[PDB]
Structure formats: structure tokens, C-alpha cells
């Protein structure tokens, strides 16, 4: 029914985003991004990083209906990668691995969205998001 179109579209989007996020969170390369940085083990993390983000929080935000478009979702993936580059110094090999992995996460997420979402469906999501 036409009156159910908005809800049906967003449900489809959320299902897709939840699948994408699960694919990222279970990828061994991105394990360090799968849960919030432990603010007690990394005692200076919140001093440096104003808006923490991680893949488990992205799942929650999907379920809280925070994302109306794939671009909305990608902003938080980009934040996860941005946080890693802002926080971690480029000193030791462990730092370099995390920083590289953050960029790989970003590239991988953007590539999945570009490959698996119909541009026409995205216009529909934008139209819905533009009506609210």
C-alpha cells in the first residue's frame, strides 16, 4: 500500500545497513572498531576524542532509527575512521596498524554501499529524509 511505502523503504534500508555492519564487525581486520574504545584502558581517549563511535554503537543507532540514508550511516563509519586517525599517533608499529586498518574500514564500507545499494533506492531514501 502506498501509505506504507516510507516505512517499507526504511525497513529495507535498516536491514541492509545491519547486514553491512555485521559484515564489518565480524571481519578480523576491524575487530578493534567493533566495540567502544575502553576508556579505562586508554585513559586519555576521551580527552582527545569528542565523539566516540564504533560498530556496536552503529548497530544500536540503526535500531534507534538514527539513519534514514546510507549517507547518514557512512557519516558514522567515517567518524570511526576519523577518530582512529585523530587519536592514534604515528609512532610505533601497533599505531600504524590501527591507523591503516581504520582507513581500510572506511574504504571497505564505502565500497559495499556503492556496490550493493541501487542509486534509485537511495533517491527514495533521500526523498523520505527530505520530507521530515
Amino acid at each position: 500500500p502506498l501509505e506504507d511505502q516510507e516505512e517499507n523503504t526504511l525497513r529495507e534500508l535498516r536491514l541492509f545497513l545491519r547486514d553491512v555492519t555485521k559484515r564489518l564487525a565480524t571481519d578480523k581486520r576491524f575487530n578493534i572498531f567493533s566495540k567502544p574504545v575502553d576508556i579505562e584502558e586508554v585513559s586519555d581517549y576521551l580527552e582527545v576524542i569528542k565523539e566516540p563511535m564504533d560498530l556496536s554503537t552503529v548497530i544500536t543507532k540503526i535500531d534507534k532509527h538514527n539513519y534514514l540514508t546510507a549517507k547518514d550511516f557512512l557519516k558514522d563509519i567515517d567518524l570511526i575512521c576519523s577518530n582512529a586517525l585523530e587519536y592514534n599517533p604515528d609512532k610505533d608499529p601497533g599505531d600504524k596498524i590501527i591507523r591503516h586498518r581504520a582507513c581500510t574500514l572506511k574504504d571497505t564500507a564505502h565500497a559495499i554501499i556503492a556496490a550493493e545499494l541501487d542509486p534509485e533506492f537511495n533517491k527514495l531514501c533521500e526523498e523520505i529524509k527530505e520530507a521530515r
Partner: peptide, 6 residues
């Protein structure tokens, strides 16, 4: 940047 995680 912070101290890092190493």
C-alpha cells in the same frame, strides 16, 4: 593525538 594503545 593521544599516547596510543601500545
Amino acid at each position: 593525538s593521544g599516547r596510543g594503545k601500545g
